[PDB]
Amino acid sequence: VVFPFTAIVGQEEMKLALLLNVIDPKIGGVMIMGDRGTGKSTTIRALADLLPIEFKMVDLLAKANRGILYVDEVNLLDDHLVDVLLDSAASGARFVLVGSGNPEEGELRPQLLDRFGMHAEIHTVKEPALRVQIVEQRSEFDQNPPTFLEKYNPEQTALQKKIVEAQKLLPEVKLDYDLRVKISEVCSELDVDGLRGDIVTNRAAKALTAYEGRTEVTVDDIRRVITLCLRHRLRKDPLESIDSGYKVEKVFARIFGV
Amino acid sequence: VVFPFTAIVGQEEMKLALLLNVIDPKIGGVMIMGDRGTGKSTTIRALADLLPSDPFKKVQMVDLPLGATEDRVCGTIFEPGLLAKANRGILYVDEVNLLDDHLVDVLLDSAASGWHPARFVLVGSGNPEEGELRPQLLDRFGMHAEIHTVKEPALRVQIVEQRSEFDQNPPTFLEKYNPEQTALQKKIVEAQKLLPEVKLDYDLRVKISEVCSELDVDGLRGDIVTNRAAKALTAYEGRTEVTVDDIRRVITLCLRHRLRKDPLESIDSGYKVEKVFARIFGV
Amino acid sequence: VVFPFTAIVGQEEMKLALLLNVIDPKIGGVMIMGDRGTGKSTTIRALADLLPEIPVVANDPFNSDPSDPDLMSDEVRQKSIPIEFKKVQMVDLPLGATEDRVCGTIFEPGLLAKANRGILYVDEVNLLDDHLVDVLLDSAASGWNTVEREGISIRHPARFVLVGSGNPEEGELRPQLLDRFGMHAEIHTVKEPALRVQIVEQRSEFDQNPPTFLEKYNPEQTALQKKIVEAQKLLPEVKLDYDLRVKISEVCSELDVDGLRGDIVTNRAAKALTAYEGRTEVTVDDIRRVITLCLRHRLRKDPLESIDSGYKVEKVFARIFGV
Amino acid sequence: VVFPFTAIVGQEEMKLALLLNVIDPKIGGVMIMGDRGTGKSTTIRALADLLPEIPVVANDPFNSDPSDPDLMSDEVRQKSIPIEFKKVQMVDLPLGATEDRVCGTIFEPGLLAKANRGILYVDEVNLLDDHLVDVLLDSAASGWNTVEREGISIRHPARFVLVGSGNPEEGELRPQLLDRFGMHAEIHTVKEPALRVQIVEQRSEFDQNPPTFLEKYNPEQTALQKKIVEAQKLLPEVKLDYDLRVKISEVCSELDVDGLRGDIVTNRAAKALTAYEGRTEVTVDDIRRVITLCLRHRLRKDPLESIDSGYKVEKVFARIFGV
Amino acid sequence: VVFPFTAIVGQEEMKLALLLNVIDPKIGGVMIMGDRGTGKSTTIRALADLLPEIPVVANDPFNSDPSDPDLMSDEVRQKSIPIEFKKVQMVDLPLGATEDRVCGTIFEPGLLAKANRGILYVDEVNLLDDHLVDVLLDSAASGWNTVEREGISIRHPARFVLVGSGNPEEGELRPQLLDRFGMHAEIHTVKEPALRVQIVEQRSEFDQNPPTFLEKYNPEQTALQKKIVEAQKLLPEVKLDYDLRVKISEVCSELDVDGLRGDIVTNRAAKALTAYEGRTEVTVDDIRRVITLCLRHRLRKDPLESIDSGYKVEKVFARIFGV
Amino acid sequence: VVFPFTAIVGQEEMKLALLLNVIDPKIGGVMIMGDRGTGKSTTIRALADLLPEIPVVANDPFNSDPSDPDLMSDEVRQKSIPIEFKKVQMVDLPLGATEDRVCGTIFEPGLLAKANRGILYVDEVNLLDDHLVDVLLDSAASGWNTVEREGISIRHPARFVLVGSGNPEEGELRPQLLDRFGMHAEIHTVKEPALRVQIVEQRSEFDQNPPTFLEKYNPEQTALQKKIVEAQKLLPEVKLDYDLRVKISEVCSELDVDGLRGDIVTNRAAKALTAYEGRTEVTVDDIRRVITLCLRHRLRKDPLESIDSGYKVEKVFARIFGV
Ligand SMILES: Nc1ncnc2c1ncn2[C@@H]1O[C@H](COP(=O)(O)OP(=O)(O)OP(=O)(O)O)[C@@H](O)[C@H]1O
Ligand SMILES: Nc1ncnc2c1ncn2[C@@H]1O[C@H](COP(=O)(O)OP(=O)(O)OP(=O)(O)O)[C@@H](O)[C@H]1O
Ligand SMILES: Nc1ncnc2c1ncn2[C@@H]1O[C@H](COP(=O)(O)OP(=O)(O)OP(=O)(O)O)[C@@H](O)[C@H]1O
Ligand SMILES: Nc1ncnc2c1ncn2[C@@H]1O[C@H](COP(=O)(O)OP(=O)(O)OP(=O)(O)O)[C@@H](O)[C@H]1O
Ligand SMILES: Nc1ncnc2c1ncn2[C@@H]1O[C@H](COP(=O)(O)OP(=O)(O)O)[C@@H](O)[C@H]1O
Ligand SMILES: Nc1ncnc2c1ncn2[C@@H]1O[C@H](COP(=O)(O)OP(=O)(O)O)[C@@H](O)[C@H]1O
Ligand SMILES: [Mg+2]
Ligand SMILES: [Mg+2]
Ligand SMILES: [Mg+2]
Ligand SMILES: [Mg+2]
């Protein structure tokens, strides 16, 4: 037995990315770097559950037609891994290319690092009140599993209903041409080395609206996903005075105005 | 069903070289150069559909993964190998530099030798930004193209929309793009027969040999491919002649990669060739 | 036929860690590194006698337990005889060994197969080849055997303690393997002349005639055999106050430590130490005797180590608690 | 027929540690390192002649002790008799031998099985192979061996002296195996023409006629052989006075020798040397002759400093005792 | 279909070296070296067609002389006759070959057996090093190949011209393999604009139709492998004057080459060349035509000045000879 | 079928050692280093057909000795028969021989056993791996083999001369193996033009016809066999008086030589030389001719100094010999 998806607290970057990937798998995969203790492998296994013939998870070549695939070892991979990711999003086995990375040791190669389309980072909690909450939850889980999940059972049905309703809202796009020109302009303003970025963000932010249930796409929607998919492609130079995400925010502000 | 070879926005450098190598099997391949993206792989797979031992069906494109050995490459036993599939087809090599072996040398040697006869094309790619190939092994390739990322808002949105369109309805689009594709196929079929009729003046041969000799280019490989490429281009334009202008359009990208590597200063690659061409010609 | 446990002179810190870990297997193992001599394993191999007893289903090569389906083997899960008194088994692997014995060979029983609910001892862990050491990282932290190859599949629970020793002036395992071991303790050399004379005389005396000497120490050691079973009974009665947890999670968070890996063990180590003493409540003193031992190899900082890690932990503890 | 022992000219220091090890088969081993030549490898192979007898049961590859019911290896423990006296054996392993015969694979007896309680000689231990050296790293100084190659996992007694030679120009020993040996003796070439003439003449004479050369020394060899047996029975009578045991321990403190192993071996050898002379009361100037050659290779020091590693031990000896 | 030899334009030096090596198959081969292009690997392939015929025994795994020697090689010695009068073959080895394949294993012949008394072509000799270059250091210059691998033990005759090429900007060879080569012919690319057009036209004409090209050159080329054969019969009739031989060694000693192999080669090459041109005598001109490109290969490396190769040899030859 | 040994032009010093190593086959060996060419590997190979005869036991592969001490292997020693008077042999191992055909395993007779009381020619000894040179290190200078690799436990009586060649422009020998060689000789290229003319003519004439050359150089060779047979029996008659044996060792003491093996060889080589010129009394000029090449390499190089080895040895001779 594993935690339900509504057990992780505070840290929420991966949730948005994984839920966006689940609704539409055309984006690709997600690359996450973080420590070996903060709980990267625990939260993902939760997402394996509560996933909506009569249909109702793979860990590292044929049984991948439905369901995500977790690698756990791609970071130290030297080569070949390119073959599996190319073959995945090439029709003749659609699945989510969720992956695990570490800030040190293997960092992959810029030739491959631009085949994924999503990237989020992990930061420390730095909160005594929250850490004791997590410790208490883990302890009461360890005391006995079965009664713990039943307590959090009610919200899982609501989450499933929301995901199912949002999945079938594909025609809701209403994406404005002027905003498409503006996003292409801001992306092309910095060095991106290809057209991989523009296609990913155009089909990502729109889908976020489908999560909420609205129809139109405004600046607020894009602002929350613009950094998350156009940061690791910004490998300008090792002279990193500040994190590239802040540079993305700077160019975002200088163009739209905020 | 795949993307047609007419909707690729811009990038006339790759298309011209690919067409020339298609209409002239003995040129010796291309080494498309550039950074990531910009449709290196889409164009190659878009070329295969646009196509109609010693003595016929539809052509097939053959590719191999980066991780391979002689178990599949050789195709040892009457088992036919991977190369024994393109008797009238094409073969693709990716990240050539990442393949540290003599297998790449074997493939180059198998070219221009129809004895198992294969007679395919040898498009090369990779090396976005990870060290140039060996100065010897790079000298057995016909022409060296180049790809650069488009820098403009008007096109950058359009291409994206175009791609999105192909995911709205992958079928029901070829008929919309049918008339453009058929025009190119008929033209290339016609041009494949007019080639053995071009005449090159002896006087221009002296001038082109002088142009080659003025540069400190080693060997004679720079004067066995240009003569064929100019004839192929002139035949492609549907004529039986050659002027000084046609050679100019297939000389910069045919001999650029044979130049001296020495970084004495920052002379541009094509600028030196253009300067020499202007110096020894009346253009 | 070996050196009795209650004959070691000095080296108190290692004994405390070993007994604390053997009280409750939810520890994560113990790491021992230090100079030659000083009886690194002279003590570890002496733990065969000082062990409790557990019930095991009869004629079970996998050493399963009554019920406990979560960790119940195949022959009791899908098929479902009486249990009997049995001893906790300690097994060790040599530095030079093949890979056939460690894993399965096809079902044959592997080295880990006859290691459940026991203690795994490795000697000179810094000299083992990387081929074998990459298999233990699979069975550990997963609690399940993996070998199912050769066309026929087989599953097997696997859980041990994995305590080991080594030498610090040759290498330190892998950067990631250090996090598998929950506890880490080091030994120095006692330089008091009287203690050295005492240990030399003790070793010489035992070297004369084994059976007469060991029996002399019988009255004391047996008492320990009837003092460690008390901790395993009073353990599920200790309680922690919110003021204690809010500080055990504050001291760790103040230092640049990996998230929720150091706080969990320190919350389960001191809480068990009282059971060894015999009380039912935890005081501030009990924190001081386990805080240094637990948060040592998690402390990742700059390569410069002019200060002492134990000194840093003690001073931050004093500053936070005001002691 | 090999060179007789009591004919080697000079080299008094090296010609005593071997006898000390022969008298008491528990101290450890003697590793001899010196310049090329000097006959390091001719004394060791000639030691087989001067050799006492020990009792060992009949029809047993392990050569177990008929008494001491705690040392029975495999089946005579279950059976718990043709007791016979026998000469102890000498077995040397070649440098170009694999691990098949060193440990044992099939249960056939390995090379280590054939050298129980005897003498194991290694030639040019400086090189070996850095891979086979690991299996014997822990088998010695433990008294037990375990083999698990295929289908057999049995505990195997193993004890020997592990004498070895070397050359200090092809590398240095690993700082872990260096502590298994007991004493370290250095060799310096002779520098007097008369002795060189003597050794050349004696070698030529032996090469002239092997058999008639032995009779010129046989009574001396018999006389030496009688002395070893007598000193092998009077050993458990000597006794170290308590003040001396405290005094010797303080020497190990000042030199900062890591590990409490130098103290044990230094004490053990002092008793044996006294039994060789015939007395039964150790005294100062009797351990003075056995300390400088036992606290030299265990002395970690500054990379360069300025000591031959020989003056410091005697300086501390003089400071402590006073001579 | 291959490019006819007589159609190759230019390169009047390397053609001479190859032709002089074919007529007298004992000089020691050539080591053609130069920049890219210029057809270094075209002529070698072309020379296969223009080759003579030699007698050989049948059923023999490797070529051998029918009855000229006493056949001290293998069972042909005491078994002593089918002769097929076959043609000498061309054998080449790849850069990725392995040592066992070159010699043999459990008796399967290797590459050496095939390339005996023949032209063994080595591709890019500069890159190959260490492995599979030490075994070749005894098969040549001795005539006998010794194989003592995997128990199999025989003796193998072997001698070959060993024609090898390579690039001049990828390092230089070690001296041991450098002196096994007879001559050393350097290639320089044509630079006159009036000449390259001819090469381009000839290549284009050949590529248009490989047939109807040999007939355009068949009468001319068939007049080449008639002068060579006739030159072979005349060769064992030349008589170099004694006076010249004195002066030839003077150049060698004055230039201070290393060894003595630099004087046996020159005489044989001069005799073969003077037999090629038709006469049955030797003049000064014949020496000057081949001494330039024989000794230069063996000069001493010197980076202290800017003196090229061949220039010094010509200067010394002019100074010591007539004019 | 091979080049005659007595027709070698010049190089007297190389001819001296290869004869002294056959008259009394108890010296360590020889080592000759020099430039390319100059026939280092031609003189050595010509020695095969000029050797004496010794008795052998039946057809044993180990080449035992019937009328000799207890050195007749182990299987023959059970007896203590037919006599054949065979001729000694020389066996050479290649540059890439596998471990199977050096120590021997299966009992398949190894290469060392088949080269007992013979000569082992190690060509190009400058290029040999760190392996295959240790298994050769113990068999020499000890005269007993020990193979314990694959289930076989056999001790072989092995003894050879260990003749090796090579050139010094590719590395330096290891310190241990550099001492097993007996005497070291140097080769320098000839410079007189007339000698070069003679040597070229000789080689060309020999190559012209393999036979009908022994028919010329027969009488000058058959006299050498009876020149060595007589000298092989007068050796155990010559005695060096005690006056000079004291002096020779002094020389070594002055040169700071390492070991006492560099002094035994000279006292034996000097006795061998005087038995070759007919005399039966060693005097000066019979040890002066051999002390130069038997002590040249057993000397500390000390690259700080800039004095050649040859001059230093002769400089100190007159210091104590008054010349
Ligand atoms: N209480 C003690 N303190 C120190 N040394 C002791 C003590 N009791 C025994 N010894 C001795 O210390 C030595 C160390 O024993 P052990 O076999 O464990 O070696 P070690 O050096 O600790 O282990 P390793 O060689 O694996 O590092 C032995 O000689 C042992 O008799
Ligand atoms: N007292 C002595 N000191 C030195 N050498 C002696 C002495 N007595 C005899 N010798 C002779 O000196 C020689 C030394 O060679 P030996 O085989 O003993 O060396 P080793 O110990 O194997 O040397 P290495 O250190 O090179 O392995 C032998 O010929 C031996 O007979
Ligand atoms: N006389 C000639 N001189 C130079 N090139 C010639 C001559 N005759 C023909 N050629 C042509 O010149 C070209 C040189 O290419 P080729 O393959 O022979 O080069 P190469 O010397 O073998 O090169 P590499 O060093 O790369 O192996 C070929 O097309 C060959 O047909
Ligand atoms: N006495 C001699 N001195 C020098 N050279 C001689 C002598 N007798 C013959 N030669 C000839 O000199 C040449 C030397 O070549 P050889 O093969 O003997 O050299 P090497 O010493 O074996 O060389 P390497 O060091 O390459 O093994 C041969 O042609 C040989 O016939
Ligand atoms: N919400 C949470 N916040 C903090 N820590 C958590 C949380 N959930 C689980 N953990 C802890 O994190 C552990 C998993 O750490 P994780 O980083 O996934 O390991 P790894 O990176 O080695 O796979 C869990 O076993 C638990 O102790
Ligand atoms: N006309 C076009 N010009 C440039 N790029 C294009 C065009 N059409 C599609 N693409 C892009 O090319 C990408 C795939 O090719 P590419 O990434 O270049 O392959 P590779 O990375 O192997 O070179 C697609 O993601 C697509 O967005
Ligand atoms: Mg230990
Ligand atoms: Mg020795
Ligand atoms: Mg070539
Ligand atoms: Mg030779």
Author numbering:
A (entry chain F): 14 to 65, 101 to 104, 108 to 111, 142 to 173, 188 to 353
B (entry chain A): 14 to 65, 77 to 79, 103 to 124, 137 to 174, 186 to 353
C (entry chain E), D (entry chain D), E (entry chain B), F (entry chain C): 14 to 93, 99 to 124, 137 to 353
Question: Mind quoting what the paper says about this structure?
Answer:
Iterative rounds of 3D classification, performed by multiple-class ab initio reconstructions followed by heterogeneous refinements, revealed two distinct classes, which we named hexamer conformations A and B. These reconstructions achieved global resolutions of 4 Å and 3.8 Å, respectively, with much greater local resolutions in the central parts of the structures. Conformation A is characterized by ATP molecules bound in five monomers and ADP in one, while conformation B has ATP bound in four monomers and ADP in two. Interestingly, each monomer contains a bound nucleotide molecule (ATP or ADP) in both hexameric states. The Nostoc ChlI hexameric ring conformations have diameters of approximately 114–117 Å, with a central pore of about 33 Å. In the hexamer structures, the nucleotide state of each monomer is related to the structural organization of the insertions of that monomer, such that when an ATP molecule is bound, the insertions are folded and in an upward position. If ADP is bound, the inserts of this monomer are more flexible or even unfold, as demonstrated by fuzzy or absent corresponding cryo-EM densities. Interestingly, in the observed ADP-bound states, the side chains of the adjacent R210 arginine fingers are positioned somewhat away from the nucleotide (inset 5), in line with data from other AAA+ proteins. Arginine finger R210 and sensor 2 R291 residues from the adjacent monomer additionally coordinate the nucleotide molecule and contribute to the inter-subunit cooperation within the hexamer, which is typical for AAA+ proteins. Not only the structured inserts undergo conformational changes upon ATP hydrolysis in ChlI but also the whole hexamer ring experiences rigid-body rearrangements apparently caused by the ATP hydrolysis-induced reorganization of key amino-acid residues in close proximity to the nucleotide-binding pocket. According to our model, ATP hydrolysis occurs in one monomer at a time, triggering rearrangements involving residues near the nucleotide-binding pocket.
